[PDB]
């Protein structure tokens, strides 16, 4: 029946998650507790008891995540440097003192923005694996930022770009979000790629 | 074993939650999905399929919450008015045009704050059932607010209180948080009680 239908779905949903993480269990004793709970029956474990163990489960989960995080970080830095080394050679790529690299898609003729100016742009940011994490295409509307409020790579690139230009920049993690990053698709020590079209400079 | 131990705890934890809410299920088909998932076996339902039904489960959950919310709201207003009606009589209670009620614990002799002044106070806010939702006792440190940035009942009361006084105010929901309130311990149309000690007035 409709009941039977959903129940499976929820558990299928749940069960995957656990596994994918690190929750090594036995759905038999686990199915047991569920029935106790719903039947409002007396629980095989003291409120305290459970909490005591759950509290230890999370603490150990936290340890696990931190493990992955620090491992991902070391991994992405390694991948990040391989990408840039590989890219340094590619046709049209210029490498700057800061390690920031760019390739000119189309050169503009307007003024280059200063450190304090406001800029209007259109862009798409992607990870080395093509995954798009941000872009003005979705919103269909250009973005406006103050040159100094953006990530270092952008700050470094914009000061070199004539208004009207379209560059593709390749950003070392130290010039993007760095070792930290419990944010969106961007992880720790992730090197990023951006296609940036600088529309105009507001020397405000 | 240690495994068996935890598994139960998690499921006991989970199972309660569902029940307490409205998730009428059968932990048998639900235990089934969990095993499929972990064994990485082929799932009895198409990725789509499950989502299709889960998406419908939440939407129906949302309907359920909204149900409770609106019901709680009508309930708390009724309780709120019974409390104030009962309280209007009690020794020392003054009822104001706005329905706000207060009782003077101890009268100060300083100046009464104006609408724009900053005030320094110590206080404890509780629901009609004694549940404390806020207080400066916990932090051990007085709070400072601008008379107009606080809830109406407070704004109404403070303008009447001589600096140094300690009043207990009984606040109609329309002068506290009103019909809205997906916040802390405070729900919809909840009438509140406060013990407020006005320490000083900064006629800033
Ligand atoms: Zn365009
Ligand atoms: Zn353009
Ligand atoms: Zn005190
Ligand atoms: Zn005092």
UniProtKB/Swiss-Prot annotation, chains A, B:
InterPro entries on file: INFPOTNTIATR (IPR008104), PPIase_dom_sf (IPR046357), PPIase_FKBP_dom (IPR001179), PPIase_FKBP_N (IPR000774), PPIase_FKBP_N_sf (IPR036944)
Catalytic activity: [protein]-peptidylproline (omega=180) = [protein]-peptidylproline (omega=0)
Coiled coil: none
Domain PPIase FKBP-type stretches: 116-204
Broad class of where this protein is predominantly found: membrane
Enzyme Commission identifier(s): 5.2.1.8
Keyword field: Cell outer membrane, Isomerase, Membrane, Rotamase, Signal, Virulence
Subcellular location field: Cell outer membrane
A GO-annotated cellular component: cell outer membrane
Pfam families: FKBP_C, FKBP_N
Entry GO MF terms: peptidyl-prolyl cis-trans isomerase activity
SUPFAM superfamilies hit by this protein: FKBP-like
Family (UniProt): Belongs to the FKBP-type PPIase family.
Biological role: Essential virulence factor associated with macrophage infectivity. Exhibits PPIase activity.
Protein name: Outer membrane protein MIP
Organism: Legionella pneumophila
Taxon lineage: Bacteria, Pseudomonadati, Pseudomonadota, Gammaproteobacteria, Legionellales
